[PDB]
Amino acid sequence: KVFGRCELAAAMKRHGLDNYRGYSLGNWVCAAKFESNFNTQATNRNTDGSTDYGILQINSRWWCNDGRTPGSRNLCNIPCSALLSSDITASVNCAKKIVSDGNGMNAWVAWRNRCKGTDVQAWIRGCRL
Template sequence: MRGLVFLLLVAAASAKVYQRCELATILNDAGMDGYRGTTLADWICLIKWESNYNSSAISGNFDGSTDYGLFQLNSRWWCDDGKTPLSRNGCHVNCTVLLTDNIRPAIVCAKRVVRDYTWLRSWSGWRNYCMGRDLSSYIAGCKL
């Protein structure tokens, strides 16, 4: 348990709250725009409503699992936090890796969610605030 607490403290120390356009540039460079039919605006909207652009965001769920990082990737399905029973760890990462300013592992995992499951519908933030809406404001003014 001490090890997990230490890892969470280290992750929090290197976490970052991104600016919208800064994040849009990073995601664009990582090939997120157009990935499996998604748009860059979809991703920025999703991240806004899931984590408010905060790479250290953590949220508990009713089933005892936890959501981690910018994309709020769930410990039951996508990462191993060492405490969620029967974690599938579909991205083969420790959840603390998703809490730093190195968002490459989070991007790789988010792509896997989209590739292997139901596009962006896996995220309630996207379903509730982004799906079927004009999202152009999420990348407006960004020099991409």
């Protein structure tokens, strides 16, 4: 599913991401835009042989099982394919664990390079939330 911007903002707000660990909703919308283009089905192979899955590009070396990432963990206890659903519940639940992990939203390279230090509230402008 390719989400609209405000459609994803509303879904992320319902699932409790607004201000989760002090990250305003626009941080999460901006991250999704630059990680996945708002596409739940996005997948990208990494150099290390892991893959990133879904709207928040959650990596198979630590967080989910894809059966092809040797020596990896599955800390969200989910198949990586669950993070490709039109329902973002599994991605949001796992993202809440990731952002609690130590480096905060710096775990998302697109957030760090394209959202951090910017006017991230622009990403929820116009949305009825």
